[PDB]
Structure 1
Amino acid sequence: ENYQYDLWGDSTETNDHVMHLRAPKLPPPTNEESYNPPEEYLLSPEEKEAWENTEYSERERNFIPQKYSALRKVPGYGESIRERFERSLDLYLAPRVRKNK
């Protein structure tokens, strides 16, 4: 019977405290991340080297867009574990600040 009952039930309780700061989700993926993006999104070799030489925390984008003519041609993503590890590290090591943008 481990975890075999109703936890929340019918309750509608809220956790709206002054110092309850919720992580603001994660931005949705954009066009350039697609497996078959429009041709204009691909980086030039100069831009590719500029991205390659930038520090991992200074890169505006954590990947190089690629275009594939078929679904079977797509390769398994390489930095898949590292992204989850970085997200989980931010979830409890990154200070959270209220701000009025």
Structure 2
Amino acid sequence: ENYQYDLWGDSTETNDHVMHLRAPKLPPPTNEESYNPPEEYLLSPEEKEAWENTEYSERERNFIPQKYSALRKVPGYGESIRERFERSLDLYLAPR
């Protein structure tokens, strides 16, 4: 019988007493990186080659937009773990 207690209870105050609580900097909303984005953002072969040429840490646009009219046609994503691990590292491994 654990966790059966109000951890926070009545509380309406923030950490403003000490302003060292830096904002978590949560990721912003998406930027049309959908499986069915506008046809204008359909990466061309030249654009795809240019994106592939760039290496890690210089890929601000870290997604290859493409159109998939069928859900089954969506390819598997294996880079999700690496990207979120990098986010976790950057959460607290950067000077502030």
TM superposition score category, shorter chain reference = 0.7 to 0.9
Equivalenced residues, count: 96
User: TM-score, length-normalised on structure 2?
Assistant: 0.81
4+ residue runs of structure 1 moved beyond 2 angstroms? Answer: 1-4, 21-32
Provide the residue aligned with 1:44 in structure 2. 44
RMSD: 2.5
Between structures 1 and 2, the one with greater helix share: 2
- Distance in 1, Cα, partners of 2:15 & 2:26: 21
CA contact (8 A) 1:56 1:62 kept: no
- 1:17-58, CA deviations, whole angstroms, 9 ceiling, x for partnerless residues? 454243353343435311111111011111111111112101
User: TM-score, length-normalised on structure 1?
Assistant: 0.78
- 1:47-89, CA deviations, whole angstroms, 9 ceiling, x for partnerless residues? 1111111121011211211110022322232211011101100
CA contact (8 A) 1:31 1:37 kept: no
- Distance in 2, Cα, partners of 1:7 & 1:77: 38
- Distance in 1, Cα, partners of 2:64 & 2:91: 25
Unaligned runs of 5+ in 2: none
How far has the Cα of 1:9 moved from its partner? 0.2
CA contact (8 A) 2:15 2:21 kept: no
**1:72 counterpart SS class:** helix
